[PDB]
Each structure stands twice: as structure tokens, then as C-alpha cells.
Design a protein around this nucleic acid. Sequence first.
DNA 1: TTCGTAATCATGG
DNA 2: CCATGATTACGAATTGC
Lengths: 416, 990, 218
Amino acid sequence: MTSSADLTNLKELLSLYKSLRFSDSVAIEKYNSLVEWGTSTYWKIGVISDYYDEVKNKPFNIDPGYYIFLPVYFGSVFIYSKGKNMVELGSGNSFQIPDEIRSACNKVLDSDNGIDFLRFVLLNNRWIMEDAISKYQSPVNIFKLASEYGLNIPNYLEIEIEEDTLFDDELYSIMERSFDDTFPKISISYIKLGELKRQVVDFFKFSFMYIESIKVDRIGDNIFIPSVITKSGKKILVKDVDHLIRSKVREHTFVKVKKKNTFSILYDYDGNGTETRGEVIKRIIDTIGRDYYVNGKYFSKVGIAGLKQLTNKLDINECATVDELVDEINKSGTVKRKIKNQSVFDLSRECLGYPEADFITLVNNMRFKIENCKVVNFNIENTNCLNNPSIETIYGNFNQFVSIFNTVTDVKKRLF
Amino acid sequence: MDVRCINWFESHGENRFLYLKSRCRNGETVFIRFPHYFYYVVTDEIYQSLSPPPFNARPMGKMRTIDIDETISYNLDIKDRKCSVADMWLIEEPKKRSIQNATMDEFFNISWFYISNGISPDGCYSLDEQYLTKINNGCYHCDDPRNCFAKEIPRFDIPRSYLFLAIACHFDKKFPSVFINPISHTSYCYIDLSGKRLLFTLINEEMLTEQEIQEAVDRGCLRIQSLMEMDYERELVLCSEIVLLRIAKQLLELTFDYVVTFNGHNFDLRYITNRLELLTGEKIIFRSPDKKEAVHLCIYERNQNTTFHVNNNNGTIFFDLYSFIQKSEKLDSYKLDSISKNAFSCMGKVLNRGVREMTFIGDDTTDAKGKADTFAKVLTTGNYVTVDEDIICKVIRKDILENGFKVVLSCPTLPNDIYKLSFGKDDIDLAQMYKDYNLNIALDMARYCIHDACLCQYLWEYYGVETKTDAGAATYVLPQSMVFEYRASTIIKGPLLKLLLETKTILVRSETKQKFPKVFAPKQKMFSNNVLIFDYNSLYPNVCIFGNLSPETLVGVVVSTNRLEEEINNQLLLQKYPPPRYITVHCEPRLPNLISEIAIFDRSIEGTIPRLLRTFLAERARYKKMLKQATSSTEKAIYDSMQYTYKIVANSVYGLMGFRNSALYSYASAKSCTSIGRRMILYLESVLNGAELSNGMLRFANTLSNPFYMDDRDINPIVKTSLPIDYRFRFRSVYGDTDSVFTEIDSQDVDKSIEIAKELERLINSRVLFNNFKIEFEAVYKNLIMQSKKKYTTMKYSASSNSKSVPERINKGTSETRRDVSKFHKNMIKTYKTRLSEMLSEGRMNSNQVCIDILRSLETDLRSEFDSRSSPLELFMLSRMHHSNYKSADNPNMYLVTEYNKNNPETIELGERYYFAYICPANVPWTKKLVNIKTYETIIDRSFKLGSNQRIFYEVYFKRLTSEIVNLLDNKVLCISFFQRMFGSRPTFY
Amino acid sequence: MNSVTISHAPYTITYHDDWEPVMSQLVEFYNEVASWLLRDETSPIPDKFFIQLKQPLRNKRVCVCGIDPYPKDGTGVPFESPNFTKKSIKEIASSISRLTGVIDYKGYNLNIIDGVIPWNYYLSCKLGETKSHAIYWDKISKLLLQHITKHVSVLYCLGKTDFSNIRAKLESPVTTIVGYHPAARDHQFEKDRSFEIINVLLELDNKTPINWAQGFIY
DNA sequence: TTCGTAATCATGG
DNA sequence: CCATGATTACGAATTGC
């Protein structure tokens, strides 16, 4: 091997190993394939928590100098890196963002190669910027570029410290008041000039408090998040369904809550109880009602409706009958290609908002009766798979998925 | 000018050529030298778009290029294949040239040479003298092979010259080495062009103190001092080592045709060359026919395991029997003695007795036609003969009769009249003979060496390597020397290229192929009822022909990940792709998420692989028919070689379709072939299992329905037969795989089983099966005990044999040569297998009756042996080889060897082989639980006497005995209980 | 760090501790090869056959090997030329100067660099007869090479034909790279880029790269 | 590339 | 807790004196 291609590929693997991310399935697959190629050709080869130090919760004296303070918000955290898709902590999966936002993020990232990744805060379909990590450019420098592209930017404070300063409660309150942000302030992260290490401060304290009941509120197009109400009527923010189940909440009981100077949040259950998640899943559903299904981290409806989604999903006008629906699809000129490049089952699944894995498991356990390229009758084969109540709810709602599938097939046949 | 070809070889000098060696009618040798070019196939536009003109271009005509890439589809809307029809050109370049868009890059240059010039590698040709220019004595140069080789003449017989060699060195404790161990004996068998077979042996003098040489010469041997004064007609020549090596070098340098040696590329030739170089600086030189290139011997290696080859460039073929035997077919042991056992055998009658000798007569009226002649041929140089496959005898007097032989041997009296004779192991220890060297030892070793040398010739004539080489060279379109050195991926390109040129089609892959990702067990092991064996007639080739599974006849692959789309796709599949034009085959998915995968094949136009397979099958059938109607022996050998070649080339297609870097890669076609084979096998198993013969009528277990689609044949389960009315039998199905199917009949009448098997074969072939699927009745098996097709023992009767016939003792899977088991365990396994075979024929065996008897016998015999302690120590001795090529830190064997070295003046080197056994204190009783056995291993020396304070650790040996016995038998719970009672452990089955 | 006695010349071999667990076997081979070796005069002298044994194997990462020693004016240390007259060492020095950009230089010694080891597969050769001692050395060479390979990180071979099948020679799977001829015709060695892949793998092997400039002689 | 047995560790009855 | 099951590792099945 004399050509420079092998050595370029070798530094490519070196860079990938320096910035390894197991969350990205495609990146790990390519890395494994190239590792296999190297270890077969050469017979052998040599092959975000750690970016954050220990959390501080007590007052302490600080070293005088120049620092940049940024607010950490209460919301789902995402990390975006060049060459990889969106990544959220824990699950390791990805998300869906508008193509314009992705293009803006790529334009931000490729400008400076020293930016390892960018931070995204997501809470009830709202993506905002919180912080960034770069070995050469300060986050303040790239904040102006992010604001120029139209993306929102956080509140950064550049403070020069001359004498010794104690980071006590009063100083934290002064910093919070100076920040003046309506969104919740879960922590304060400060970076010293010329220092690559990232350090964060989050005071917290615990108490016990009662809950009247747990409700759920409407957020938009079949997106719901649980809402807990207390005796005083104050709202306690909850991350997602995963946080609720891992906290092991119980109705009409006193629970331990970790409180700030402005908001109080439920915290995970660290006890040695023998409670099982599976029955908690059905208990919380029964308490909240059987008309909701768990789409992973959130709750989604079961409403019949039926015909008032293809207009919504296709972003067209309202429909009344089949013929005018066909005509309205006919006069479409741009979105029409989506019909001609994407399948029918997936289109119906997107129209009714079912999950992917759960629905695939559901359709692989029952039998149908197909006639004239259409489905007319259906029945179940094995009843064990209905152990999960959400599967039972989808089974009940299947009588509308069948109808919308039939309508989509009819319009597909009519158009071509 | 009429010449028959022998070998084609290449010269790897600065200017490369190609060489043809040929023989005329008289016997003279003619060499012809051709220029060798680099062949490229291009499109017309590329040919006209070459800035430097090529050396020469020849038109090829219209060709159709098809992209054979496979694309996974998730719907039923499939894009058609993209094919381009265009003019093609073949260009030749003296040196290598890079072409941007060349095609057909997976074919060798020699195949292109042969096909373009229209030359057969072994055909007889009447050459034209106009195009040949003389350059030396016996070597001509040609430049227009197309016209010089235009005329073809029928084959004519030619003489040949052969050389066979054997070497015997000196060794005392370890394997011989060049630096300290000299050569004692050399043996040579020589065949020249005149048909005279010479045979001589050279003995060293350095161990033959002067008066001893004087006496040896007085006995009749010849002593020589210089190289020039040796005559080949004298059998024994007694000379020095340097003269011996000079004679060996001179003999190896001659322009022979074949130099045949058994494992001589690793030991014999290497030792000769190394010792010759070490003693004298003079080397051995091979010269090209045109006297332009000279090379020295350097045996090189090829990895496939490691196979050693010689670097000669004079046209002689240095052939090794070891590699040919390993790759030709599978045996149990690949030793020379075992091959002689399995090759040369006969049946003889005892004509005399008395004292410690026997007289055996062997004739064609005892075993078969031709066995006696072969045994007589081997007996000329034989010294030891095996009787009953158990005893070894020394030949005293041998007389070759008119059509047989009679031999007297030294063996104890045996109460029988007809026995078995074979050539095998020799009861000779070479280590002891070298300690006290004398003339008797020298002459005996010379005889042994000459027998070893002649064994190579006998095996060469037995296996028919010459005719196989010629047939392979003709069929594969390859040189003779390259026939037995390449795998299946190389011997397939010739016929494939010919078929592609005849069909005028090219297949191109324009992507990278991703590295995408069964053992059968019989229902029971012991039978005690007759087993009928049927053989499928080339199941996979017939499946490929029937389904038309070819890379270019794949309409598509439709996959689905859920049942709704699966059902919709199935309905549209049955709607718009109807049979019999299209065939849809279900296959296992290639991805973890797909639930359904269906491949679609079109049968409107024949593919490429089915055409090749049908051509091969037709040619093999024709050659079988021609062989069955031939009377000359040479014609029979030629036809057998051709049919064997066609078989071995037609049985390699299935493996080649599933190989990533082959020229017939078709992954979907591979799955389809496997699936259809499994379906056919299961359908036959279902229809045969339970079929019975009631009155003069037969009933099956299921309808004779076609297992793929609707067919117009009769589907009545009840069939009318022609067997006698009184027969009322019930049949069973036990075992079935790709190449055979087993059936079970409950009787012990061999003639009845044979006739019913013939009737079943006729009925199955005529009615049950369909299209080109047929089966053949092979044999009948009795006393069958099997674990798989690898491991089984039974007695075999052929289809054309009556009750009063000699059985064939089939026994394989066991090695009986593993020198790390015991001397006693082998004998006990043999005794109990014999007892099982003898008792299973009684009639009342069932399932839970034999196990009790065998377990009781084992318990009683083991207890008696433990309570008697009458077995000698030499029956419990194991062996291993000492070597420091070990990983880890200790590897306790090294510690034991070092301790023995420290505690005993006798020294064990790092190449010696040492014996060891299991010795425990004499007072320890029977123990059930077991611990690390590596502690109890003790080295047994020559002077070791088992004292009264020690005994043999019997429990280990008995545990291995019971484990191997329990591997047989039917019941599991009884074996578990017995093993726990004895040793308190769980046996590891299978 | 001890000494052993041999029946024939050089009658005494001094060895380092790291060489202890293989060197024993070595002697049992040198007893059956030295008798035929001393018949012909060879370079270097028999006393200098085993002077490379002093270099410890702990602090070395890169292995550079040659098929044969210098036929004339050999010293024992492979690829060493005090007068800077050998073609191979001159080409190596020129390539190193081109890679590092250093224009002014007087010589190059591979033994000065800490982390690389200069080794010869065949430890002896008769003057005027290249590669005429393979049979004598084969086993000793294999043993020493498999001892070196167990401690180095990456091993680089010089000469395509000489090390064509070097993988089969070593049972242990170790990262191996095979280069072209040191003095190949058509300036083939000028385009060689092994000195970069070597320290790319060295960094990939979590090992410090090699400061080649230390090998220069001024 | 196979099979085969011992030495070790690990896991659910 | 420990019998039972499953991994790991070792080495001949090697061949020519």
C-alpha cells in the first residue's frame, strides 16, 4: 500500500475515534465496517458526561478572572455534531427538524472545525439554543452567528472578577435577576476564558408535598404531556412519561419533590421497592383514562375523526366527499410527489400517528382478509400480545385505520 | 509432423513465452515456442477511441451486456433489466495496459489463447512446417498458431518415460536433520521410451568398515568410486555419500516426463538438495528448452493446508501422490500403509497348514476379476502381508501362477478356510537397526526402500492419474501441469467462457457485494432391520435446471416487513406473474426486519448456469453409454476419466454460486436452490413414510400432489404393482439428505428386499416424481449403527448381489490411528462393536433390551479387570512430542519434562517423542469425583518398573471407554444413570 | 544480563534479561549450525553476530528489518554505515531528509532513535554472495523474529519479494506492513509513504510517535 | 478447517 | 448455595525418518 488514500482513511478513523458517538447507527456501522476492513487487510489494528465536572450545590469562593455564564434550562437535551444526526442523551436515537434548521446548523458547524457539538433544548415542540463546546472559538462568538441565521440564542453574561467572590444564594439570585428569562432556569453553567473544562452549578433542596391528581393538557396535533396538580394548585413540571414512571408516582399521596427558588420538580425514586414498571404502566393509564396511548415519551389521542387528517398531513384544504378529495389532490403540483415516492401503509401510519415498532408488532400478530386489493375483514390470532394496554387501544382504534387505508388506496387507484 | 501434446508451461523471464511439449509416433520429443500476449475485450467506441493503436484486434461481433446486480424491492413495481447490444473487439498487447472501461476481466490469458486459437490442450495435430522456424535442436518457434494448428487428427498412442524415487536417512532419537544425519539408502525405478523397467538401489559406505565392504562385494554387489563407472542394469551399487548425491542430481536433471514421489516435495527432494549443497557447493540446474533460462531448485509453498511445489521450467512434471490423494477424495488416515491397505486387497484360500506357516492361493475364482492380477503385481517387491486385517506375516516363498498367485507366510494356525489378504504396515523398527548396523540390516533396508519406491508406481497405475490429467486438461481448457493445483473457482472459467461466447452474452456487476450472512440426525441409531439406500441423481443441478435459477433470469426479489403488505403483494404476485412461465420461490430473509422474501424467476428463455449443467449432464451420460460398449482397456480408462472429470466439474456449481469472489455469484439463486431441494426431500420423505404393500397393491401416506403448483398427473394415492400377492410389508422413513434417502424394511431376506426396492424405484421414477427428478437404488445395509454419514458401521450388499455373497464391511468415522488414546481402549471398543453386530441379528432386540446386556457386560468386564490387575503396563502407554512452542506461563508438560531431566541422567531433547502414563498410589480406591489429571502424568522410561507402591489410574481410561460406548445406543436415561453410578458425571453426547 | 558458553565460536554470548526466555532454545540450534558456518569467511566476524541482543525490547515500538546484512564492511548493527557509502542507507537518509525537510546532513543512524529497532532476518552472509545463508539461519531467525514481534507495536518490511509471505512465518497475528524494494528501479521507493502510516498506527496504538530527526548524524 | 477433552467461570433451578 | 450449562483454550487428525 503506497497510495495516500489508505493513510487519509486512517486519519479519518483516527478523527472518528477521537469523536466517537455510539448513538449514531450509521456512523457506528461505517466505523465497524472500516475496522473490519483494516483488521482483515492488515491482520490486526489497535482499535457527554465526561465534558462536565462534578456538580456544585453549596456556596464556595470563586477564583477571580473572566467568566462566561449561561443558563441551563429545564428540558430535553440534544447534541448535534457534524457528520451525525441529532442525538439525545440516554436513548441514543434521533429526532426530526426542519431542513432549513439543519442547513443553518451545518453552516454554523462547518465554519469552525473546533466546535465539537451544539446543544439543543427541546420542551413541547420548541427547539432553542443553550450552550456549545468548542476548543478554539468561544460560544459567545458563535452566538452572534446563530442569531444572524435566525435561530434563537441564550442569555450570556461576560463577567470579569477582580477579588474573591463567594457563590452564595444571594449571588445566585442576583445572577438570575440579571439574566431575566421567562423560561425556567434549571442551572447556571460558567466557562473560564482559556479553559476547555465546563463547570456547572445547580443548587437543590428536597421536601415532601401532596398532589391532588395528575391530569394531561393539550399541546397540539396529537401531542400531550402529563400535568400534575397539587393542593396549592401550583404546577410541577414533568420531563416525560419516562420521568413519571421512573419517579414511581402514586395518586393522592405525599411525594418527595426537589425545589428551586421559582419551581419545584419531581425527582426519581431511589428506593429499594419491588414495584414493577409493567403494572405501573397500566395503573397510570387507568387513572388518566384509556383514551390515551404512550407514544414513547408522550401521550397521544385515540379519536375517531377519520377523514380530517389527510388534509392536515398533506397541508391542503378541507374535504367533503371522495370525488372532490381526488380533485384537490389532482390540482396539487408540488406535494404530489410525496404520494408518488412513499408507500401507502407508512402514509396511513403517519396520518393516524401510530408508533413504528409497536404498530409493526401489532400487524404481525393478526390475520386479514384481502379482496380486490382491499381489506374487508380482520381478526386476531394470538391474544398474548394484547398484554400491553396501548396495544389493546390501538386494536380498538384499528377500525378507523382500516377505513383511512381503504380511502387512500381508492384515491391512489383513481389517480393512477 | 503429427504430434500429440503432453504439457504446456510458461517461462517467467524478462521476455515471457509459452511452451508446448509434444511427442510423435516414433517417440521423438518436439518443443514449440509461442509468444504470449495480454488479452482485452472492449466495445467498438473504446476500440476506435484509443490514441495508441493496439498490436492486433480481432472482431467478435454482436454481444449483449446485462447488468446482473440484485436490488431489493419492497413493492411489486419492478424496473426491467438494462441490457446493451453492441459490437465487441478482442485486442492483444505484448505488455500490460490499463483500459478505463474494459469488460470480461475475470478470465485467464491461457484460456483466451486456447479459445481464440481454437486449440485443445491434449489434441493430436498435423502441424504445418511453413510457420515453424528452427532455433535449436528439438525446439521450434511459431508465430501464427491459428493456421499451424488448423488440422486435427484422431488420437494415437505414444510412449512415455517415468521416474520414481525413495530415500532412507539415518535417525536415532528425533526426526532427521541435514546437519547431523546422513543418507543411507536411495531407491530408483526408471522407465525409458523403449518400455524397459529398470530398478536399482544405492547404499552408503561410511557405515561399512572395510572388511565388511570386502565381504559384501564378494557376495555379489558392485562397488564404484567415480560417477562415470555406474551401470543402471545392476540392482545394488555400494558407494559413498558424495557419489550417491551426484547420481541423484544427475538423475533428477534429465528431461523425463513424470517424476512421482510420495510427500517428496517436503522431505525427499529438499533433503537431497540441502545435503548436496552442504557437502559440495555444486547445485542442480534446470534449463529451458531454448537454453535461455537457468534456475535452481527452491521448493515453494501454496496456502489453501500448505502444499509444496517445485520451480522447474523444463517441462517435466514433479508429481506428488500425497496432495492428489488428499484433494481427490476423503479417507480416515492418509498414511502410505493405510492407502495400500485400502487399495491392494484380495480374498484367498488356505491350501496347507502345519508348523508356523500357511499356504495361500489367490485366483479370480475367489474374489473378483482383476484383483488377483493386481495383488500379483504388488507381490513382486512385497515383503510383508496382512492377513484378516489383524496379523502381519513375512513372505518366505511366492510363486506367480498363470492367472493368480500362491504365497507361504509365517502366522499362527487359524480355524478357517477363506481369508483376506492385503499389503499394509511392516513390523520393522528402524531405530533399533541403526544402533547395530550390519549387512543383513543394509540389505533388508534396501529391499524396504525399493518396495516403497515401487508402491508409488503401483498407486499411480491404480488411480489412473495420467488419464485424469488428460481429461481435466481437455475439459477445463487448462495446461496439464495446472490441473491438480487450482480450486473450483479456476477450473470453471473455461467452459463458462465457451458458453458465453457461443450464447453471445456478457454479465457485468457494477457495485460492491455486501458480505451477507443443515445437520440431519436419524430417528434412531440401531435398526436390526434391512435398510434400502436410494441416491438422488444430481439433485442440485436438476433443481437449477427445473427452476431456471440464473443471475440473468431473476425478475426480482419482493420483500415485506408486515403481513398486510405481504398479503397484498402475494395477491398481486399470483395475479400478474402466473405459472408456469414464472416461478416464485419463498426464501429466508437476508435482514433481521424482513418477514417475507420471495424471488421471481422467468422460464421463457434458458439461462446460463442451467445450460452449462445440462451440457455437463448430457456429456456424462454419453460417456457412460460409450464406456458400457467398449472392449479395449485403454478406451475404458479414457472414458472413465472423462466421466469422472465431468462429474467433479458438474458437482462444484452449487458451492460456486454462494461464493462471493466467483464468476457465478447468485445469492437469491442459492437460496432458491436450497429451498427447492429441501421441499423435494421433505415431500419424498412424507410420501414414503408409512407406504405399505397390501395384496398386490401399494398405498402411500399422502397425495401425489405437485409441491409447487398444479399439475395434470394422476394424484391417486393407491397404485397397482406387479409383486407377488402374498407380500404384506410396512415401510418406514428414517434418514434423508441432499445426496441420498434411506428406507427401512422389517425383514432379513436380502433378495426380497432387493426385488421390492427395484419395484419401488420403478414406481417412484415413473409416477411419484415429476420432470427430470429421479432416484436410483444403491445398496442394502444390515446391522446399521450410525451417528451421521460421517460415523457409521454396518454390512453392505450391492444391488447386483444375491444372498450367497461376501458382504462389504462398511466402517468409517473412527480413526483407529489416534496415537493419543490408548492401546487397550481400542481393543475394548473393537470387542464390544463386534459383540453388538453379532447380537443385533438375533431377532429380539427392540430398544430397551440391548442396552441392558451391553451395560452389564461392560460393568462385569471393568470390575474383573480392576480386581485382577492382570493387564500389562505397555497396554496403557500414551505418547506425545516435546516442543517449547507454547504460549502461557507453565503448561505443566514442560515442568514435568524438566523435572524428569533434572532427576534422571537420560535427557529428553526438544524434538524427541516421549511416552507417559497415569500413575497413582497403589492404595487409593475407586474414586467417582475427579480432579486435575495433569498432575498424575508420569514419564515412562525404558527401564521403568511399576513398583508395589504404585498402580495405573484406571478410572480415567474407563470413563473414556464408557463415554465412547454411550455415544452409541438408543436410551438416554439409562446411560445417564449408569454413568452417574460409575463416575458421577454427566456424559457429553453427540 | 548474563553470559552463556557455546561449543564453537564465538564461544560466549552475553544477553539481556528480556532475552532470557527464548535464548536457551537458541543455543541448541547454534550447536548444529556453527560447524558448517565457520568453513567460509563471513562478514561480520563471529564475535559480532549477537551484538544487537543488548537493545531492550521494553522501550521499542517500531521494527525495521532487512533480508540480508551488508555483504562488505559489516559491523553487526543492521543498516549501519559509518562512512555513508551503502546505497540503501544513502537512499534511506535521502528519504528521511525529504520527509523532514532537513537539507544539511552528514549521516543517519537508526540505533540513535529511541523506539525503533534495526534488525536483520539473516544474521550472517558470505561476502560476495547475497542471501547464501538462509538454510543455516532459518529457525534461529524465525525464533528471534517471533520474539521481537511479541513486544513491538507495528512491524514494517523492506522488499516485496523477500517478505512476500512473511505472515505465514509468524503465528501470532500482529499489525504488519510490507513495503517495496529499498532501491527499486523506476524510482518506486521515492513514492513510498510507509513512514507516515507507521506513526498513524503508532498514535492509533496509543503510543508516542517517533522523532525521526534524532537519527541524523552531524 | 475440523473434532475433542479438560480447566474455568458463570447462571438460573 | 451449587449442579448444570456454556466459553475458553489447548492440540492433534497431522504426513515423509
